[PDB]
Structures are given as structure tokens and as C-alpha cells.
Amino acid sequence: MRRVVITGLGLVSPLASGVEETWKRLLAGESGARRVTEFEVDDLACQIACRIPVGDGTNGTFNPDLHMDPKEQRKVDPFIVYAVGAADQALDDAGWHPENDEDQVRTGVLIGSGIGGIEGIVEAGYTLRDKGPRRISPFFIPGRLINLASGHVSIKHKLRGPNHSVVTACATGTHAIGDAARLIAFGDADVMVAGGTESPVSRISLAGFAACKALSTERNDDPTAASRPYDEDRDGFVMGEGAGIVVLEELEHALARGAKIYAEVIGYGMSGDAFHITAPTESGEGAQRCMVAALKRAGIVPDEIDYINAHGTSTMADTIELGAVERVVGEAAAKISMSSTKSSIGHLLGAAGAAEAVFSTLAIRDNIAPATLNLDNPAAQTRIDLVPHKPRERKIDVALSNSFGFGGTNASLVLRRYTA
Amino acid sequence: MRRVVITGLGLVSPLASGVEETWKRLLAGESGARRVTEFEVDDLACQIACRIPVGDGTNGTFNPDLHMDPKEQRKVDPFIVYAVGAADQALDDAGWHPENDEDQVRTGVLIGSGIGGIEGIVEAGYTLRDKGPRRISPFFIPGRLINLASGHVSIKHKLRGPNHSVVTACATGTHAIGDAARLIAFGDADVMVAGGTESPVSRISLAGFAACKALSTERNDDPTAASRPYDEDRDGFVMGEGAGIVVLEELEHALARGAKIYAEVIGYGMSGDAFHITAPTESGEGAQRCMVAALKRAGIVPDEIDYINAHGTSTMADTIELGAVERVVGEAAAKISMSSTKSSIGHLLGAAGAAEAVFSTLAIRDNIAPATLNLDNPAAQTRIDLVPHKPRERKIDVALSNSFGFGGTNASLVLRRYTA
């Protein structure tokens, strides 16, 4: 089994396009939450979302034209464009652009999404009913398939290794990264472009998530205060959009070319709640077993954990997760920092785990735990440092990142500073 | 690394609900293809599909009421129902129904789908526009998420191990089984319920695949002749629906409890074409590398392959895969039988690999290669035995199953008779 390190980062987020710019804004306490203006929301229970700032590419804005010609953008749903953007950044960061046969066939891609092209499916549904089948675009199917994010990235960068994709709701980005690391550890690839992408800010998606009572509805006129993980007055998640990507690389491969190393992927755990289609198990036992499995894989004990990037969606379940984490870490609780960056950028669904893996990696690099914004009145008493309001500078060598999705699908990743 | 065996099978197919009943009809030369009658098709380029025979559960019919209450069936898209039915069958066959804590936490589920709930998403889109957002069902989101097939199966059978899902178009079923076998090998689970499910026979799906010129269009008045892999007169694939499930089990676990053992999962390979969103590479080089990787993992040479269950969708690509197989197997070509069972049940998209893994397993059990129906005039001359028209009894100890999907995503599985 080979060791796997992170050698590139990419991020298209509700704060910025770009890793350093998102991170700077995150740490400064900026929020991506705002009123949705791009489509009708006056009749929706939830009128807010965390949206990518679109522009010419300067000042941290996202210019999709820098990654895909506008004619090509019109053929796909936004989740594909976000993945290409973040993948471009990550490969640039890694200094990895496979040109010879060996480098191409040993580099793959594994990018997941939770819901994929729901928006474009609804639009094509209208074309079908209104205008008829001969008006359906030849690009309808490929531009809406979840695995075509991997597809577009592979084609653009000549990545001929394993081409794969996962779909596990809120856990997607975390499974994608764990699975890509295993592909490298087991010898199927030497480099993987891995992560998650989502474009869930659409009328049908906001309506659908409101219907199952998942979304914040009481702060439509104060959107930056809406996402408030662990707070007494939390009322549901705030949807976000974008993509997180990491370049993963076998350790010897990285050292032999002198690639800068951000951190090492050392653990990965998975479990199932087997409880309910949308509700978390009341006891948190599934989350607990997931974390335990990841730590066992990593060969570490709770005394070695510094930072936890929570699932922490700003729902009633935040406290169940907190309870499960407390049981896992025991007496180490008082020296661990745990925060939810969903307080800042909302819930990116299938991309959440990938964005949060990037943030967990930067927390190690910079020895700083991101804040939980809006934590005015914690719902529970805990010894864990929930990093309320402002980031905390502290030693961080080991980060744990949790994702617990619809259907009872749980995944955790353990990252550690690379020393030797 | 632990060894992994197949200890249960389940199948809901266009020939029958049931493994043995599907297999019997398959070997008898029956076709699932018929003119679509459940919705409007007369304005579509393709008017045919391979559909599950629905009924009371007798005579090989599918009775969803045996697997899910009618009130629950109407809360999900059909792909979830088909997965529950095939998983029910596979667990009954394996005699595995976890009741104690250990058995529950050590059994997981990994069921994939290529397109999931496209049909119900279109319907909710109509509800949204016509009736308004307050009339969107609370079940709209969970009933349409691809990972909720794993979710429902986990909930029904108390499966608390890894709960996971993959989405790789035509490759989905093969990746799902390969990845579930790795979860066992690596120690994340001792038992996995694994496979693929698809419900792509709808107006939106038929219109979408016709728009990208993927479907057969010239044989709407002779549906059973339309799917004709490798034949000179092929003109695109025939859509099918259903689910295939295998119970995978660590070898010593299977042996200790007296489990039946159908075969062993010995190899798994992946690659990416990096060529085009839907078109196959002219060279077949990605398909070649995928098979070579699978055989390397399995530790076998091509002379040891007996049967190949082809991707073989009845498209222009058929001859490219055939060329890639010839280059992989060299002088063994004259010994090997390769057939496409898509000739009989059409293309189950994300369930195709799972159904075809079940067929590859039974080809080993019964020492018989399924036919390629409709192979009147092969499009190329090859030493490979394409098993035209009628199945062929022969020694089958090793089966290779290929899946080469949209986006250039490739996966292969190698199965071998279990000796010791």
C-alpha cells in the first residue's frame, strides 16, 4: 500500500474563484450568503443561497470563459463548468500537465456530484412538453450526466488513468477524495484529480429542499446570519454552489519530482445509518462508527486530533454530530477545535466535502482553524472549541473532516502534515 | 488483502424478475424488446425498449408490492424499486439477513445508477411550473437521488457498513462491483450488497438519447431484431431497464457460515479515453488498457480467459471494442468466446454491468456462453467466437466483463471459478 499526498488545490466557491482568495475571505469572516436574484424566488420559503461571484476573473471573481468557451458552457449544466475551473487551478498548483504517455495513463480523475444536472433536466422537460422531442439538444444527456465532470476534465487535460465518479449526497466530496486516494494507494494510478462539484442553486432545487424542510426560511432578509451551525436559533441549511478539487499523488512520485506537499491523506472511514431516508439517526451511532473507522485506518488516537471540519449544516442534527464527536474523542475534547465552514459558504451538497477537505488542508498549512460564524448562543454546552465568530491560530498537524448525507451515507477523511 | 467471493445473486430484467428465470429465458434466445406502449413514442426516432414484465410475481413477472408497499413505491422513481427487488433476491439467495450488531455493521451496500431519477425530476418540474412550489412533494428530493437506492436497501435490511454509490454511465454496474469488492478486500466490510439499477425507459430519456443519435431507429417495426451487436446492419442501442445485484463476501466469512459460492472476484481494471464526451476513440486504446489492467490485477494471462461478456451495445463502437480485445488476447483469440447479452435485454445503462456480472457468474456456473442474438453478418472477420444466434456450452472457468461508458469511462471485471 502506497502513501498518498496532496500536491495541488483548486476551489470555485461562494466567496471567490481561487484557493488563496477564498481562504483569505473565509478567515476574514466574510459570508457568501445573499438573496437569490438570478431567478424568481418571491414564492419560495427559502430565498437565499451562497453564490459564486461572477465577473471578469479579477478581484476573486469567477470568469467561466477562462476555463471553457462560452459555446461549450451552453452545452452543459454549471456543475461541469465549476469542476473544470477548479481542476484547472489544481493542476496548475501541482505543476502537473501530463504530456508523455506514461504521465497521461497514470493520472486519472474522480469528481463526484450529489444532484448533477437537475436544473437542465427540468429545462429539457419543458422543451419536451412545449416544443417537442426534435427540439431536445443533442447535448442534453451528456451535459447533465454526473460523470461528465470527470469526462470534461479528463478530455481537457489528457488524463487517461481511472475515470470515475461517485454520488453520495452531502458525503460525495469526501468519498471522492478517499476513493481517489485508495486508487493511488492500491497502484491503479500515480496521480488523481479528485473532488466534488455542485450547481444546486435553481428554482426546482430550492423548491425541492424547502419541501422536505431542509432549508433556512426565517432569515431571508438577513442572509449572512442564516447559516449558524450549533446556534440555538439555527433553522436549516443555506444551499451553496461550486467545486473543490485536490491533486492527489503517490508519495515517491511527488518526492522524485520535488512537488510541494500540502498534507498526507492518512485515513478514510465510511458507514451507514440504516435509519431514515433524510433524518439522521437520533443516537449519532453511524457517525461515531464512521469517525472511529477513519481514525483506525489512520492509526491515530483522539489525543492526536487538532482540528475537525464538521458536517455542521445548521440543522437540528448539529447537536447529534457534536454528541458523536464528543463520544469519539473522550477526554481530548477540550484541546480540539471543531468548526463548520458551512457557516461561511453554506452547504455545497456534493461539493461540500471537497471544499472542506481543501479548507482542512489549509488549516494544517497555516496553523489556523476557520471560524464558525454566527455562533451567538450555542445550543449545547461542550468542552470542544467551536471557534465561534473568528478563526483561531493554533497548532494543527491532524485534521478530521466529516460528511453525513441523505440516505444515511457517512464518510470521514483524516489528513496529516507530511514530515517524512 | 482478503479474497472476495459472490455468494448471492439478484436480477430484475427485461426478460424476468428472478435470476434463474432470466437466465433460462436468456439461454432460450428470448428477447425483451418491444414497442413502447406506456407513454407516447410515435413522435420519437426510437419507439422500442426492453422492459421488465410486470405482474403478480408468478411466471417470472415483477411484483413491486413484494418488495415495497404501494404507498412507498409512489414516493420514489422506479430505479429505487428495482434495486430493492434485486437486493431482496440476492440476500435471500445468500441467506444473509443481519440481525446482530456485528453482522449489521460489517455489511454495507454500494448500488450505482447512471441517470437515476430523470423521469421524476421532469414530473416535479411540471408540478413546479403548473401548480407552484407549495405542491412539490416532500419526497421529491430523496426519491430522485441516485444514492437512495443504497439508502432504501440499507434501511430495509439494517445494513450499517459502508453505504456508497457510484455513477459512471454504461460503466456504473462494473465499477460498483469492483469498488464493493475492494471495500471487502481492504477490510472496510465483510459483506457487500453491490450492483446497478436504472429506470431509463421514459419519454424524456428516449428523446434525449435519440437526440444524441445513440438509439436504434430503423427497426421500430421489428423490435426483437433491433439490438444486433457486431452485425453489419446495427444502427444504435436499445434501451432496457432493471437492476442487477451480487452479494459479495470475504472468503473465510463465507466459508465459516456455509455460504454458497458462485465464483471469486479476482480482477478489476479502470481507464479513461480522454477523447470525446460520447464518441469512442478510434484506436480502442483506453479499452485495451482497462482490460490489461484488470488481467494484471487478476494475475492471469489472456490464454486463461474463457468467456468475455462484451460492452457490445450495437453501435459503431462494437468493432472498436472487438479490435481492442483481439490486441489484448493475441493467439488466445481462437479459444475465446465473446458475446453481448445486450442483444437480448438491451442496454441497461448503469445496471448493464451489474446484470452482465450476474450473467458472467452463471456462465461459469453452467459452463455455457450466452448468444449474441441477431448476428447475421459480422461487421468484421475475427478468430473470436462471437456465439451467434444460440448459446454454446463449453468450459468457462474465467469470465471477463467489459463496460465502456459515455465520458470515456472504462471498467472491467475478472471472475474465476472458486476452487480453494
Provide the CATH number for the domain around residue B345.
3.40.47.10
Please report residues of B whose CB lies closer than 8 A to that of A409.
147, 150-151, 163-165
Q: Note if A170 is an active site residue.
A: yes
Is the minimum CB–CB distance between B73 and chain A shorter than 8 Å?
no
Judge if B355 and B380 occupy the same domain. Answer: yes
Residue of A nearest to B171 (CA): A164
Kindly state whether B60 is in contact with chain A, defined as any CB-CB distance less than 8 angstroms: no
Q: Are B24 and B64 in contact (CB under 8 A)?
A: no
For residues B246-261, one letter each, b for 16 or more C-beta atoms within 10 angstroms of the residue's C-beta and e for the rest, the string is bbbbbbebbeeeebee
DSSP string, A204-230: HHHHHHHHTT-B--S-TTSGGGT--TT
Residues A173 and B92: their CA atoms lie apart, in Å, by 33
- What residues form DSSP beta bridges with A11? A244
Distance between CA atoms of B152 and B20, rounded to whole angstroms?
Answer: 25
- Cβ distance B408 to A270 less than 8 Å, yes or no, reads no
Identify the domain boundary among A244, A267, A290.
A267
Overall resolution, Å: 1.8
Is the Cβ–Cβ distance between B146 and B167 less than 8 Å?
Answer: yes
List, in order, residues 6 or more apart from A76 with CB less than 8 Å away.
A68, A117, A120, A139, A142, A143, A144, A148, A152
Q: Please indicate, yes or no, whether residues A249 and A314 belong to a single structural domain of this protein.
A: no
The cell for B232 is: 453489419
Sheet-wide strand order for B409-416 = B163-164, B107-112, B191-198, B242-250, B4-12, B263-272, B409-416, B398-405, B307-309, B337-339
Determine the residue among A44, A73, A166 to mutate to test chain B binding: the one whose Cβ has the most chain B Cβ atoms within 10 Å.
A166
Residue A224 belongs to what domain range? Answer: 5-267
Element (DSSP H or E) covering residue A145: none
* Positions of E strands within A150-262: 163-164, 191-198, 242-250
Q: Are A386 and A34 in contact (CB under 8 A)?
A: no
Answer yes or no: do A272 and B121 touch at CB < 8 A.
no
- DSSP structure string for B144-190: T-TTHHHHHHHHHHT--S-EE-B--GGGHHHHHHHHHHHHHHTTS-S
Please indicate, yes or no, whether residues B232 and B335 belong to a single structural domain of this protein: no
Using CA atoms, how far apart are residues B136 and A146, in angstroms rounded to an integer?
A: 24
Residue type, B319: T
Provide the number of CB pairs (under 8 Å) joining chain A to chain B: 279
Claim to verify: residue B243 and residue B298 sit in the same structural domain: no
From chain A residues 366-395, the ones with a CB under 8 A of any chain B CB are: none
Rg (CA), chain B: 20
- Quote the DSSP letter at residue A370: P
What is the C-alpha to C-alpha distance for residues B114 and B167, in angstroms, rounded to an integer?
A: 5
Positive or negative torsion for Cα A183, A352, A17, A143: positive
d(CA B31, CA B225): 9
Q: Cα(B390)–Cα(B29) distance, rounded to whole angstroms?
A: 7
Our CA-based measurement puts residue A31 at a distance from the nearest CA of chain B, in whole angstroms, of 26
Nearest C-alpha neighbor of B271 from the set B78, B136, B152, B404: B404
Question: Which secondary structure element, helix H or strand E, spans residue A101, and what is its range?
Answer: helix A101-105
Residues B320 and B238 placed together within one structural domain of the fold: no
In angstroms, the CA A180 to CA B38 distance is 41
* CB neighbour list of residue B400: distance below 8 Å, 6 or more residues apart: B291, B294, B295, B305, B307, B308, B309, B360, B412, B413, B414
B162 close to A (CB below 8 A): yes
Alpha-carbon gap, residue B61 to B58, rounded angstroms: 6
Kindly tell me the sign of the dihedral angle through the C-alpha atoms of A339, A342, A347, A352: negative
Q: Indicate whether B257 and B273 sit together in one domain.
A: no
CA distance B187 to B182: 8
Same domain (yes/no): A279, A243:
no
Q: Per residue, what are the HEC states of B201-243?
A: CCHHHHHHHHHCCCECCCCCCCHHHCCCCCECCCCCECEECEE
**Within this chain, do residues B27 and B52 fall inside the same structural domain, yes or no?**
yes
Q: Where does a domain end: A267, A289, A319?
A: A267
Is the minimum CB–CB distance between A70 and chain B shorter than 8 Å?
no
Chain B contact for A175, CB < 8 A?
A: yes
Domain end point (choices B236, B267, B298): B267
Q: Do A275 and B155 touch (CB under 8 A)?
A: yes
CA–CA separation, B302 vs B287, rounded Å? 15
Q: Length of chain A in residues, anyone?
A: 420
Task: Please check whether residues B72 and B124 belong to one and the same domain.
Answer: yes
Structural domain count of chain A: 2
Q: Which of A193, A163, A161 is nearest to A177 (CA)?
A: A193
Answer yes or no: are the C-beta atoms of B286 and B273 closer than 8 Å. Answer: yes
Radius of gyration of chain A (CA): 20
Shortest Cα–Cα distance, A1 to chain B (Å): 10
B258 plus B293 within the same structural domain: no
Contact B161 A124 (CB under 8 A): no
Cβ count within 10 A of residue B131: 10
| B142:A408 CB<8 A | no
Residue A129 burial (CB count, 10 A): 15
Name residue A110's beta-bridge partners: A164, A194
Residues B309, B217 share a domain: no
* Residues B71 and B197 occupy one common structural domain: yes
Contact A154 B410 (CB under 8 A): no
